[PDB]
Amino acid sequence: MVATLFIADLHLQTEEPAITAGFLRFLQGEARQADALYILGDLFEAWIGDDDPNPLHQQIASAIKAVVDAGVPCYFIHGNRDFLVGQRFARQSGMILLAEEERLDLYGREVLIMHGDTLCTDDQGYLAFRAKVHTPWIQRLFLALPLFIRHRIAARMRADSKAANSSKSMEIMDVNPQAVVDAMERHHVQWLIHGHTHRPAVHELQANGQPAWRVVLGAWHSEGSMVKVTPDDVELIHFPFLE
Numbered sequence: 509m510v511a512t513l514f515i516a517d518l519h520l521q522t523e524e525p526a527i528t529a530g531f532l533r534f535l536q537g538e539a540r541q542a543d544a545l546y547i548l549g550d551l552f553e554a555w556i557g558d559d560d561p562n563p564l565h566q567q568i569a570s571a572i573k574a575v576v577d578a579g580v581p582c583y584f585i586h587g588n589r590d591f592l593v594g595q596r597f598a599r600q601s602g603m604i605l606l607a608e609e610e611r612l613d614l615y616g617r618e619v620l621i622m623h624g625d626t627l628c629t630d631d632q633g634y635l636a637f638r639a640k641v642h643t644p645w646i647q648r649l650f651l652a653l654p655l656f657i658r659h660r661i662a663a664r665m666r667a668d669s670k671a672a673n674s675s676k677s678m679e680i681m682d683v684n685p686q687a688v689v690d691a692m693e694r695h696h697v698q699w700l701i702h703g704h705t706h707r708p709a710v711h712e713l714q715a716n717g718q719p720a721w722r723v724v725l726g727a728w729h730s731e732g733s734m735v736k737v738t739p740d741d742v743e744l745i746h747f748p749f750l751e
């Protein structure tokens with residue numbers, strides 16, 4: 509089919525087997541026919557390095573690679589949960605790693621894609637955390653630690669994140685509308701697709717002196733979510749995990 513697909517915020521983990529089964533079934537569906545599949549971050553609930561022997565990682569890598577081998581190029585933009593996904597997993601899965609912002613030409617429509625966390629520019633605490641965990645020497649230090657140490661550090665970060673999210677106001681954590689305009693005018697696009705916020709919606713705004721739209725993907729909780737771009741339209745689609 510002449511369509512390009514976008515998903516994000518699956519937060520896969522061995523403790524949520526139903527979501528994993530829904531993703532595996534999705535990879536065997538119309539996704540096998542798409543022009544391309546873009547995964548905009550937070551594919552996994554957490555990532556502590558490509559050397560993690562977590563069997564779910566190889567199961568997911570195998571299923572994506574079968575999609576790639578079937579002729580569907582697959583791309584990945586990092587999320588706040590899996591920014592440590594590296595070239596070893598890209599090779600294992602056949603995915604191509606992209607930068608934090610990418611501008612696509614989709615059947616004549618220019619579209620900006622990103623995970624979306626960098627649009628929450630009022631959360632100065634988060635952005636300070638993000639700058640640190642993206643520093644290469646700090647990443648290399650974390651990756652040199654034993655796996656059982658990395659698990660403990662990840663567990664503490666998750667605990668403190670859930671605490672800070674409960675003590676922070678939604679008005680300081682949500683997407684900043686001026687950061688959206690700035691990003692869409694930096695790339696001169698009228699269309700933007702992102703995830704992270706788990707609030708699937710289509711927001712109309714103004715950018716480049718024209719109407720513009722910000723499409724938000726949904727997290728995979730009870731059902732799946734995807735954006736489908738065709739030469740004719742942009743579709744936000746919700747579907748069950750199983751038939």
Ligand SMILES: CCCCCCCCCCC[C@@H](O)CC(=O)N[C@H]1[C@@H](OP(=O)(O)O)O[C@H](CO)[C@@H](O)[C@@H]1OC(=O)C[C@H](O)CCCCCCCCCCC
Nearest residue numbers: 554555588589633634637641646647650662665668669672
């Ligand atoms: C090189 C290091 C590698 C570490 C890899 C470990 C594996 C990855 C672990 C994932 C942690 C991630 O969840 C943190 C995060 O992203 N929080 C922001 C996010 O909230 P979520 O709970 O993730 O949905 O989205 C929310 C909305 O945007 C936002 O609010 C949250 O941001 C925060 O809550 C962060 C706080 O503001 C500041 C917390 C920093 C203090 C924690 C430091 C712990 C260091 C312990 C060292 C032993």
Ligand SMILES: [Ca+2]
Nearest residue numbers: 679680682683
């Ligand atoms: Ca706000």
Ligand SMILES: [Mn+2]
Nearest residue numbers: 517550704727
């Ligand atoms: Mn998410």
Ligand SMILES: [Mn+2]
Nearest residue numbers: 541542543579
């Ligand atoms: Mn094809």
Ligand SMILES: [Mn+2]
Nearest residue numbers: 550587588704
């Ligand atoms: Mn996120």
Ligand SMILES: [Mn+2]
Nearest residue numbers: 511736738743
């Ligand atoms: Mn259709």
